[PDB]
Amino acid sequence: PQLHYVPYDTPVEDVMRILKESGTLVIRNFLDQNTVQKVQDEVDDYVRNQPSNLSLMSKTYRCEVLNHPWMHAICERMFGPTYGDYWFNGGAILHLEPGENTQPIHQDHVFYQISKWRRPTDPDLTINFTMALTEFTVENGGTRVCPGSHLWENGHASPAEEDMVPVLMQPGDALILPGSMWHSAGANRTSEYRRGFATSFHPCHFTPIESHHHLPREMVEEMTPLVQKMLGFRTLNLHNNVKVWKAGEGNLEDATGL
Amino acid sequence: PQLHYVPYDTPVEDVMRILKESGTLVIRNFLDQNTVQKVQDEVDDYVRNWNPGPKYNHDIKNVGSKTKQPSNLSLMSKTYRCEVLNHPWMHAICERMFGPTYGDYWFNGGAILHLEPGENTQPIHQDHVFYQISKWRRPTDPDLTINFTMALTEFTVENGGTRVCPGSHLWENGHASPAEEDMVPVLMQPGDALILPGSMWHSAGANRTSEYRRGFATSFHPCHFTPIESHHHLPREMVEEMTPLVQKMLGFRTLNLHNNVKVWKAGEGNLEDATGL
Ligand SMILES: C=C1C[C@@]2(O)[C@]3(C)CCC(=O)C(C)(C)C3=C(O)C(=O)[C@]2(C)[C@H]2C(=O)O[C@@H](C)C(=O)[C@]12C
Ligand SMILES: O=C(O)CNC(=O)C(=O)O
Ligand SMILES: O=C(O)CNC(=O)C(=O)O
Ligand SMILES: [Fe+2]
Ligand SMILES: [Fe+2]
């Protein structure tokens, strides 16, 4: 167990092996700097002086970020074998004000009640992709992980604060956070904001944190068929090819003429 | 255990008690006959199957293309969505079965259960089999889903009335299905309903009569599970006429987990706020 910084061209099989062994990693140059700027600009345009879904606020988020090949290559190998389809769970902007204290160390899957039935050898209930807007430093509250704690049994006490390993990222790097990885944001002891944005996916049989059916139709039709399924507009296929999120007998996209 | 037939005014505690011991039961007079007949009429009025007259009628113009495929029961039948889904027995049981562990529940799926004459016996199964998380679940854990099978026609042994195996909900997950001789047919009049948790081994019988065995099913499951059916193709006029309870059941409102954490949100607010319900 150890925090690994790997390049963008790392083989997918190496990321999964590091994910199983260490429970987290950082994929550098996950997004290019211009995509990092576009999503912040689009969010700033929407909430120009209340924030809603990131896919509603940012065209780059729903058209570019949610089509990221790394997110889908990882999610396919993590959820595919057991659950079949996956879809978008939630997405937020992670903005730390200067002077913010250390966030409590937690696992993301704690709000799944079925996580208590889960065993550390089972596939994760959700996975998070935390992408850096500003740089992440140990002093501005960058996310801290506890490599290997994803294998701890249910009910294991949170890691001690001294066992937390800060994650250092340039803008565009991504930290991969499976739902079982103990982690928390640090205390921003600097004068500037530490800003990041995240995506999360989970099995299609799980209800997402966010619904996207308040989004206008043109916003939906400009999405790829993959992102449309991610955001809850297409019927999902379980591993047995039994279908959930159906429209009576047929597909939801056929009933809505997507 | 034993298959219990209980009257409508049975206390809620006794019903959940029976569900814990035997894993299933029937509530007599769950619905009145006229209500379940309204659902069928509304379904027939939506599908609009061609009904051949007494003799050939020399049809030329406007032939065919009238029949629609069956959609959600909440879309086809106003009685289903405006009355059946507000049933106090469904919500009393779902509250006590899902509330303490999952918080909110919502609609999972409906079904038109019509057994053809000569239909053979259905494989004996558990309804929660299509939840992969059922392999992690213990028999003492709460159920992953519950089904309410309401009879439209009479349910008999010969017409393939649903069979249950009382107590089989407590078997370990690796347990083989019950033998055919273990199954207990469920005899029901129109309006009765079979209460069917996801862990109860059951199956439709062979319909060895010349008439259809007809009925309707509702199912609910915890709010953190994705329902079989989506209802977001439904017209907005339809959603406005459902109760706030049914709007939450059919996926138009934000759901609350047990720890007051919200899922099915609209960004940071409620879905019903972003849609202006
Ligand atoms: C909005 C959320 C909900 C999320 O904050 C929730 C469930 C929010 C409420 C919580 O009790 C905690 C603090 C336990 C929590 C997490 O700890 C997460 O981690 C989650 C699951 C986030 C996550 O994992 O990914 C980011 C992108 C995100 O938007 C997510 C889905
Ligand atoms: O913002 C961060 O660095 C970490 N945030 C979380 O883990 C969270 O919000 O669940
Ligand atoms: O039709 C019946 O009596 C029982 N049906 C089922 O168990 C089913 O459709 O899953
Ligand atoms: Fe987190
Ligand atoms: Fe069944």
Side-chain angles (χ1 to χ4, degrees), chain A residues 1-153 155-192 194-258, chain B residues 1-60 62-118 120-277:
Chain A
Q2 162 209 339
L3 176 61
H4 283 103
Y5 299 87
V6 316
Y8 185 90
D9 57 71
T10 313
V12 49
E13 75 246 42
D14 289 339
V15 170
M16 313 300 306
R17 187 204 50 244
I18 289 157
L19 274 172
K20 187 153 94 61
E21 293 169 357
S22 279
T24 186
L25 75 146
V26 169
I27 295 185
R28 290 182 171 176
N29 309 302
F30 194 88
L31 320 158
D32 56 49
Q33 300 277 355
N34 278 310
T35 311
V36 169
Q37 186 67 48
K38 275 176 169 169
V39 290
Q40 175 78 108
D41 286 337
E42 279 150 33
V43 171
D44 286 340
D45 278 3
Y46 189 93
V47 303
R48 191 58 80 196
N49 204 24
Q50 282 243 72
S52 182
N53 302 58
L54 274 187
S55 321
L56 170 57
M57 300 202 273
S58 157
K59 302 100 137 162
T60 307
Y61 190 86
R62 66 169 171 275
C63 296
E64 255 173 65
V65 173
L66 288 183
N67 285 292
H68 203 291
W70 258 125
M71 294 181 210
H72 297 286
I74 292 167
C75 286
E76 268 202 313
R77 280 156 193 81
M78 179 174 302
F79 306 118
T82 303
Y83 298 95
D85 277 0
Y86 57 91
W87 57 349
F88 187 77
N89 193 358
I93 321 93
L94 303 153
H95 172 101
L96 292 185
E97 259 159 310
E100 189 73 75
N101 312 89
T102 303
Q103 175 188 51
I105 305 163
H106 63 279
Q107 299 161 300
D108 286 346
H109 69 199
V110 66
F111 81 108
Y112 293 91
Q113 258 270 23
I114 58 184
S115 67
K116 309 135 182 23
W117 312 348
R118 194 183 153 270
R119 292 230 87 233
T121 51
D122 292 326
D124 280 274
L125 299 176
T126 176
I127 185 182
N128 164 292
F129 295 84
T130 292
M131 268 141 306
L133 272 307
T134 76
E135 65 178 20
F136 277 28
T137 60
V138 58
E139 71 262 6
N140 77 342
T143 322
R144 306 100 43 82
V145 301
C146 187
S149 54
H150 69 303
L151 299 174
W152 293 354
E153 68 278 5
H156 193 301
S158 61
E161 173 52 38
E162 66 260 40
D163 304 308
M164 287 332 270
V165 180
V167 167
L168 302 202
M169 296 197 287
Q170 294 330 110
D173 307 341
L175 171 69
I176 322 286
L177 274 185
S180 45
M181 172 40 78
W182 288 89
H183 68 275
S184 83
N188 182 9
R189 298 276 198 260
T190 69
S191 84
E192 270 174 345
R194 186 224 80 171
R195 194 148 227 172
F197 84 101
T199 70
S200 61
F201 307 82
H202 69 172
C204 64
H205 219 159
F206 300 162
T207 303
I209 281 270
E210 293 179 19
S211 184
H212 294 84
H213 297 169
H214 61 306
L215 265 70
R217 193 176 270 142
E218 46 276 353
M219 201 157 294
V220 183
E221 313 222 63
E222 58 175 287
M223 303 165 190
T224 68
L226 174 59
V227 168
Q228 280 175 357
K229 179 184 272 191
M230 294 292 114
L231 292 187
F233 299 103
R234 293 189 175 263
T235 292
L236 309 144
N237 304 294
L238 298 165
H239 194 246
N240 40 25
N241 280 291
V242 164
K243 309 161 87 188
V244 294
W245 211 232
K246 282 175 325 153
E249 271 188 354
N251 294 338
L252 175 61
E253 61 267 35
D254 294 331
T256 65
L258 251 198
Chain B
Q2 156 210 132
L3 174 58
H4 282 95
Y5 295 81
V6 314
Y8 190 83
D9 49 16
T10 302
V12 182
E13 285 76 12
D14 294 347
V15 164
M16 317 293 325
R17 201 255 309 165
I18 287 166
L19 281 164
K20 205 62 217 143
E21 321 177 314
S22 318
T24 189
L25 71 140
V26 176
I27 307 186
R28 306 244 207 232
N29 313 290
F30 191 89
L31 281 172
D32 63 309
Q33 166 158 203
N34 281 323
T35 290
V36 297
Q37 180 64 41
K38 282 183 180 141
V39 173
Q40 184 64 79
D41 300 343
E42 283 149 37
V43 162
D44 299 332
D45 201 44
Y46 175 91
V47 166
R48 283 167 116 73
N49 276 333
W50 174 62
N51 307 288
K55 71 174 181 313
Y56 174 69
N57 203 45
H58 307 276
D59 306 82
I60 295 177
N62 211 27
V63 172
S65 287
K66 259 35 138 162
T67 308
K68 297 135 81 71
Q69 292 307 114
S71 184
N72 306 56
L73 277 167
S74 306
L75 191 141
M76 305 193 284
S77 161
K78 183 149 148 158
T79 301
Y80 187 90
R81 74 164 163 282
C82 291
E83 183 176 346
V84 173
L85 287 184
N86 283 299
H87 199 290
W89 260 119
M90 290 178 205
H91 294 284
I93 298 163
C94 285
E95 251 164 73
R96 278 146 179 99
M97 185 183 287
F98 301 126
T101 290
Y102 297 99
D104 279 354
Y105 56 91
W106 56 346
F107 189 72
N108 191 11
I112 307 161
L113 310 170
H114 283 22
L115 281 196
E116 246 159 34
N120 296 122
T121 189
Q122 179 187 76
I124 303 167
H125 61 277
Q126 287 172 311
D127 274 347
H128 68 200
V129 67
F130 76 110
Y131 298 87
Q132 287 302 114
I133 61 172
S134 73
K135 289 150 145 173
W136 314 344
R137 182 184 161 271
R138 284 97 65 180
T140 325
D141 291 332
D143 277 281
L144 304 174
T145 181
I146 192 191
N147 157 278
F148 297 91
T149 291
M150 314 147 262
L152 173 57
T153 71
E154 186 174 28
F155 272 39
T156 66
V157 187
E158 43 280 354
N159 79 348
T162 319
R163 306 95 52 76
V164 293
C165 189
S168 83
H169 62 314
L170 305 168
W171 299 351
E172 298 307 308
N173 197 65
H175 201 301
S177 67
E180 179 68 29
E181 46 274 32
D182 311 323
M183 310 293 318
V184 177
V186 169
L187 309 191
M188 283 200 293
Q189 285 308 294
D192 298 354
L194 172 64
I195 324 293
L196 184 67
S199 53
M200 171 47 62
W201 287 92
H202 70 283
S203 97
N207 184 358
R208 285 176 244 111
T209 81
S210 60
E211 285 302 292
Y212 274 101
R213 192 217 73 169
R214 317 201 289 172
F216 304 109
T218 71
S219 70
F220 305 83
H221 71 169
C223 64
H224 217 168
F225 301 158
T226 309
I228 289 145
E229 303 186 349
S230 171
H231 294 80
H232 279 104
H233 59 297
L234 267 66
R236 165 90 171 187
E237 43 149 320
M238 236 178 248
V239 185
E240 267 162 59
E241 81 195 60
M242 323 160 152
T243 62
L245 181 58
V246 166
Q247 290 180 341
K248 168 172 281 190
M249 298 293 102
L250 298 184
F252 302 99
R253 280 178 186 269
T254 292
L255 309 142
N256 305 311
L257 296 179
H258 196 73
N259 38 28
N260 261 259
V261 174
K262 309 171 291 312
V263 294
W264 209 230
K265 289 151 37 183
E268 263 300 87
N270 296 333
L271 174 65
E272 56 263 47
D273 293 335
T275 52
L277 277 192

